[PDB]
């Protein structure tokens, strides 16, 4: 049970890491840059997640 | 001419049922005996479309938005509908797109059109050697300041009157993606008394027009002053929405079945497993 | 032990396209007397794969070359459907505003290139031709508009509309202004105010047939072997066989479940050829121990 | 048998995915861009497959 | 709740180059403080300005932050601030030991290290004077015009 | 191998002027070939070069 809890906790906590982007929240990146410069950073989030 | 009909009444946007309508070839790739799921602007199955008709002292020709995409379906014996009026302001103020199929070719002109209050044409003294040829053109007296002109290829359409069951069906899909006009067309014979026939069919593309003008509204012209009337005709107006269909291609490449993913919860399972047979389960 | 992968290499190369009808006008439109404004741009649809290989000004003949993908010299093996020549005149500092999906004054308010644009952006210095004494008021530009324009959308309206946040109801007045403006081109100042006629070529890749490819035409067909074929711009290696595949008259080629080339049609005559890759497989070595025998 | 069949159908769908590239079929990419500009789309195809 | 009663922002000046959303659409967005900034660069340094990008003025003098959604308002000062023989009033650092991060500035005009060997302040010891001045000539092109 | 330290860092000459490259960047930079053009001119003709 502790190993399952630690696995789920790691799985959620990994969402806060930036993975090479400016920030971890997708709404701040989609709310600032235009879509053509934006596809490289979302693709970096996609490959990492 | 200036005044309208005393019996003219605007009908409300009544609704009817549309079963298998709205399935077309989404792209230009040919495929055989596979199941492809695509995303494009579509007409949802089992949706509501406007219900219009004409019978033997009511004429309704309103203005509707072209915004989210449109679907036109006309069931007519003598092919009353020649074409449509496209544009933002739909008048001489701004540019307007006019497409006309005269049963020879498809005439496309963008000009400044002086608008007559009652557009139509006429055929007089048909008693001997009918032939249904065009006689007088009363829609527009003059045209100028033309920014675009196009003439399409010669086509085949039968305007001759017939007897018996409905001999013709015209299915057209009109949409604009990033300034690219995508026109889809289907013509098939049916056996029908009243209503819509039970069946399934797919629509083929017609022309690709790189015009690129913003069109927020559209109109319909009817061609068959108080003594003149309009004949019996029917047309349907659907609304396109960006849905996702699961298409079933047979050995000949035609679309023999279509499953809308978000339509029903059984079809949600059909779209998750990518098959037309869903094994039992949650 | 598994070592390498045996593969049959193609012996020959078959590129098959019909006879040349006519040739596209690339330099005839370059010699035109005058172009339209930035918002009024003239478009000419002239199809097929190959325009003209004899006369090519694409190499260091003009003022400014900003290209994406490949240059016109490398376009001779690539077959495309539509060719749209767009003509408009800009100034020197607005060359930087032409690029797919990027903003700007002329990008947002006049014309922005779509993200599907694969062509080259061609500019030429008109100061020895289009320039006039005291400024050229013939060309125009729309500096202000009520809303942003999507890629490939044209607004030719020259009338007086809302400029700022307060509508003035048509005719000029009530602290509004006339949206359209004109260029001030003067021959004696620097590059930023120098006119550049911009001709851009927008490409769309579809399945429609091209009737003209290269100086060579027939290259007689050889079937039942793996060869390098280029048909309508698709280069691959496989066996050309006849099949029962039924294609619609306007559909040139099909694809399989792996989203790879399945069957193609002859652009020259009426035929349907199925692409089946030539047989290959692995090589297994049955050998004893090194201390026993080398067989 | 269904898991093995379903596994090969997974490979066919992976062959049809674009993986963030211009087109999922490699022959249009090798036949269009020159090798230095093409290497951007090819590294995306190799790591994804 | 920036003052909407008095608005001079509509076509009152020479030219408007805008990005993102207009001041008219800022009513649907919520900001705390709004600073109106004013500065002068040359014509050649206009093209080096791009959102979150590199350049000669970007990694050396000042880089604009990634958060700017507003309009860039400009007026033509070439007939006022520019002078014959160069304008020595404004100063700039053309070279710096390292590239700047986004939204970072160094305004110091004093004498510092030029090359890879520090000369310890005041000019000498086979170093050169880091600071440079504008060479603005009214008879040349757009690149030398103040904006 | 040419030693530019006694030619520059020693400050034994009257003056020097550089074009396109800093005098301190020549230690980590260099090109394929180096030439030396020797000629005698006057003082007023130094600015003409």
| F interface residues, E as partner, C-beta within 8 Å | 8-9, 11, 22-25, 27
SS3 of C141-169: the string is EECCCCCCCCCCCCCCCCCCCCCCCCCCC
Q: Contact C100/A36, CB-based, under 8 Å? A: yes
Establish whether chain E is in contact with chain F, requiring a minimum of 3 CB pairs below 8 angstroms. yes
- List Cβ neighbours of F25 (8 Å cut-off, separation of 6 or more): E115, E116
Q: Name the one residue in this structure whose structure tokens are 């499953």.
A: B259
Q: What is the DSSP string of chain E?
A: ----SS---SS-SSEEEE-S--TTGGGGS--S----------STTTTT--TT---TTTTTTB---TT--SEEEE---TTTT--TT---SS-EE---SSPPPTT-B----S----SSS---SSS-TT----EE-----TTS-GGGS--
DSSP C279: P
Say which residues have a Cβ less than 8 Å from residue D4's Cβ, sequence separation at least 6.
none
Contact state of D32 with C70 under an 8 Å Cβ cutoff: yes
The distance in angstroms from the start CA to the end CA of chain B is 65
Size of interface B-C (CB pairs under 8 A): 49
User: Which residue in this structure is represented by tokens 């040359």?
Assistant: E42
By DSSP bridging, strand B96-101 and strand B106-113 are antiparallel
Assign residue C219 a region: left if phi > 0, alpha if psi is -120 to 50, beta otherwise?
left
Mutation target among C46, C246, C264 for the B interface, most CBs of B within 10 A: C246
Strand locations in chain B (E): 15-18, 35-39, 47-50, 64-65, 70-74, 83-87, 96-101, 106-113, 121-122, 136-137, 143-151, 170-177, 180-187, 204-209, 217-220, 235-239, 244-249, 255-260
Determine, for residues A36 and C101 on separate chains, whether the beta-carbon distance falls below 8 Å.
Answer: yes
Distance CA C215, CA A7 (A): 65
**What is the resolution of the experimental data for this entry, in Å?**
2.8
Classified as helix, coil or strand, B20 is: coil
Q: A interface mutation test: which of D17, D19, D20, D43 has the most A CBs within 10 A?
A: D20
Interchain CB distance below 8 Å, A36 and C103? no
Residues of C in contact with D30 (CB under 8 A): 235
Q: d(Cα B79, Cα B61) in Å, to the nearest integer?
A: 17
3-state secondary structure of D12: helix
**DSSP letters of C237-268?**
EEEEEE------TT--EEE-TTSSEEEEE-SS
Q: Note whether C261 contacts D27, CB cutoff 8 Å.
A: yes
Q: In angstroms, rounded to a whole number, what is the distance separating the alpha carbons of residues D14 and D48?
A: 9
Where do the H-state alpha helices sit in chain B? Answer: 265-273
**Shortest Cα distance from E133 to chain A (angstroms)?**
35
Chain E interface, best mutation among C143, C181, C187, C190, by max E CB count within 10 A: C190
Closest among B138, B107, B101 to B122, alpha carbons compared:
B138
Question: Which residue of chain C is at minimal alpha-carbon distance from A38?
Answer: C101
CB contact under 8 A, C190 and E143: yes
- The residues facing B35 across adjacent strands are B248
Q: Which among B56, B59, B116, B125 has a CA at the least distance from the CA of B91?
A: B116
Write the Ramachandran bin of B213: left for phi over 0, alpha for psi from -120 to 50, otherwise beta. Answer: beta
CB B44 within 8 A of CB B260: yes
Give the span between the Cα atoms of C144 and E18, in whole angstroms.
11
Q: Which of A41, A45, A46, A47 to mutate to test the interface with D (most CBs of D within 10 A)?
A: A47
Q: Which chain E residues have a beta carbon less than 8 Å from that of C193?
A: 141-142
Whether there are 3 or more C-beta pairs closer than 8 Å between D and C is yes
Measured on CA atoms in the order F18, F21, F27, F31, is the torsion positive or negative?
negative
Q: What distance lies between CA E109 and its chain's CA centroid? A: 15
CA–CA dist B94, B91 (Å, integer): 7
3 state DSSP class of B14 = coil
- Dihedral, CA of residue C157, residue C161, residue C163 and residue C166, to nearest 10: -160
- D46 interfacial to chain A (CB closer than 8 Å): no
| Nearest residue to B41 (alpha-carbon basis) of B58, B20, B27 | B27
Nearest to E35 by CA among E65, E13, E15, E56: E65
A-chain residues within 8 Å CB-CB of C103? 34
Q: Which of B212, B227, B267 is nearest to B1 (CA)?
A: B227
**Residues of C with Cβ-Cβ distance to D32 under 8 angstroms:** 69-70, 78, 118
Closest chain D residue to C205, measured at CA:
D28
Report chain A residues touching chain C, CB-CB < 8 A. 34-36
Tell me if B238 sits within 8 A of B43, measured CB to CB: yes
Burial E21-45 (b: 16+ CB within 10 A, else e): ebbeebeeeeeeeeeeeeeebbbeb
Closest CA to B60 of B117, B124, B9, B122: B9
| Long-range Cβ contact pairs of C28-32 (< 8 A, separation 24 or more) | C29/C85, C29/C87, C29/C199, C30/C57, C30/C124, C30/C199, C32/C87
Residues of C with CB under 8 A from a CB of D: 69-70, 74, 77-78, 118, 205, 230, 233-236, 255, 257-261
Chain F residues with CB under 8 Å of E126 CB are 8-9, 11, 23
Those residues whose C-beta lies under 8 Å from the C-beta of residue F29, and which sit 6 or more positions away, are F21
Pair E60, E93: CB distance under 8 Å: yes
Contacts of D45 (CB under 8 A, 6+ apart): D19, D21, D26, D29
Length of chain A: 49
SS3 B73: strand
Q: For residue E74, what are the CA distances in angstroms to A38, C109, E13, E39, E81?
A: 28, 17, 7, 10, 14
Q: How was this structure determined?
A: cryo-EM
Quick one: DSSP state of residue B80? -
Between chains, do A35 and C101 touch, taking CB under 8 Å as contact?
Answer: yes
The distance from CA E52 to its chain's CA centroid, rounded to whole angstroms, is 14
B112 class by beta-carbon count within 10 Å (0-12 exposed, 13-18 middle, 19+ buried): middle
Instruction: Write the secondary structure of C168-218 as one string of H (helix), E (strand) and C (coil).
Output: CCCCCCCCCCCCEECCCCCCCCCHHHCCEEEEEEEEECCCCCCCCCCCCCC
Tokens 């006429």 found at: B122
Picking from C251, C238, C203, the residue whose alpha carbon sits closest to that of residue D22 is: C203
Q: What angle do CA E65, E68, E69 make, to 5 degrees?
A: 160
Across the interface, which of C93, C108, C164 has its CB nearest the CB of E142? C93
Number of alpha helices (DSSP H) and beta strands (DSSP E) in chain C: 2, 15
DSSP-derived letter for residue B220 is: E
User: E95 contacts in F (CB within 8 Å)?
Assistant: 22
On chain C, the residues whose CB falls within 8 A of the CB of A34 are 101-103
Nearest CA in chain E to F8: E126
D28/C234 Cβ within 8 A: yes
Do the Cβ atoms of C77 and D31 come within 8 Å? yes
Cross-strand partners of E17: E72
> How far lies E55's CA from each of C3, C202, E44, E62, in Å?
52, 30, 11, 10
């Amino acid at each position: 049970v502790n190993q399952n809890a630690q696995a789920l906790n790691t799985l959620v906590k990994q969402l806060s890491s930036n993975f090479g982007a400016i920030s971890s929240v997708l709404n701040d990146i989609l709310s600032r840059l235009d879509p053509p410069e934006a596809e490289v950073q979302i693709d970096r989030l996609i490959t990492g997640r | 001419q200036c005044v309208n009909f005393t019996t003219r009444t605007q009908l409300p946007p009544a609704y009817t049922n549309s079963f298998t309508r709205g399935v077309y070839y989404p792209d230009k790739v040919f495929r055989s005996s596979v199941l492809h799921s695509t995303q494009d602007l579509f007409l949802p199955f089992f949706s509501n479309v406007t219900w219009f008709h004409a019978i033997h002292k009511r004429f309704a020709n309103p203005v509707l938005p072209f915004n989210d995409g449109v679907y036109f379906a006309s069931t007519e014996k003598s092919n009353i509908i020649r074409g449509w009026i496209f544009g933002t302001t739909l008048d001489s103020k701004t540019q307007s797109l006019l497409i006309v199929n005269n049963a020879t070719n498809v005439v496309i002109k963008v000009c400044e059109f002086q608008f007559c209050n009652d557009p139509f044409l006429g055929v007089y003294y048909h008693k001997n050697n009918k032939s249904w040829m065009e006689s007088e053109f009363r829609v527009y007296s003059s045209a100028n300041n033309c920014t675009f002109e196009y003439v399409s290829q010669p086509f085949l359409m039968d305007l001759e009157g017939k007897q018996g069951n409905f001999k013709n069906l015209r299915e057209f899909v009109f949409k604009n993606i990033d300034g690219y006009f995508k026109i889809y067309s289907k013509h098939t014979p049916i056996n029908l008394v009243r209503g819509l026939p039970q069946g399934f069919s797919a629509l083929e593309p017609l022309v690709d027009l790189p015009i690129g003008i913003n069109i927020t509204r559209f109109q319909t012209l009817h061609i068959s002053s108080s003594g003149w009337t309009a004949g019996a005709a029917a047309y349907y107006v659907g609304y396109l929405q960006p849905r996702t269909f699961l298409l079933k291609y047979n050995e000949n490449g035609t679309i023999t079945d279509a499953v809308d993913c978000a339509l029903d919860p059984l079809s949600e399972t059909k779209c998750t497993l990518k098959s037309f047979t869903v094994e039992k389960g949650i | 032990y598994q070592t390498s992968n045996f593969r049959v290499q193609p012996t020959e190369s078959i590129v098959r396209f019909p006879n040349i009808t006519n040739l596209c006008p690339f330099g005839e439109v370059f010699n035109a007397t005058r172009f339209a404004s930035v918002y009024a741009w003239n478009r000419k649809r002239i199809s097929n794969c190959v325009a003209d290989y004899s006369v090519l000004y694409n190499s260091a003949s003009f003022s400014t070359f900003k290209c994406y993908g490949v240059s016109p010299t490398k376009l001779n093996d690539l077959c495309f459907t539509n060719v749209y020549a767009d003509s408009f005149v800009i100034r020197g500092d607005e060359v930087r505003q032409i690029a797919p999906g990027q903003t700007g004054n002329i990008a947002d308010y006049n014309y922005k290139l779509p993200d599907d644009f694969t062509g080259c952006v061609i500019a030429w210095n008109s100061n020895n031709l289009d320039s006039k004494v005291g400024g050229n008021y013939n060309y125009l530009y729309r500096l202000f508009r009520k809303s942003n324009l999507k890629p490939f959308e044209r607004d030719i309206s020259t009338e007086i509309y809302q400029a700022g946040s307060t509508p003035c109801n048509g005719v000029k007045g009530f602290n509004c202004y006339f949206p359209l403006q004109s260029y001030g081109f003067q021959p004696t100042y620097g590059v930023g105010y120098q006119p550049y006629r911009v001709v851009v070529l927008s490409f769309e890749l579809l399945h429609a047939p091209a009737t003209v490819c290269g100086p060579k035409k027939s290259t007689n067909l050889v079937k039942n072997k793996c060869v390098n074929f280029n048909f309508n711009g698709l280069t691959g290696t496989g066996v050309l066989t006849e099949s029962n595949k039924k294609f619609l008259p306007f559909q040139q080629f099909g694809r399989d479940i792996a989203d790879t080339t399945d069957a193609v049609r002859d652009p020259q005559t009426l035929e349907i050829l199925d692409i089946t890759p030539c047989s290959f497989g692995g090589v297994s070595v049955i050998t004893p121990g090194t201390n026993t025998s080398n067989q």
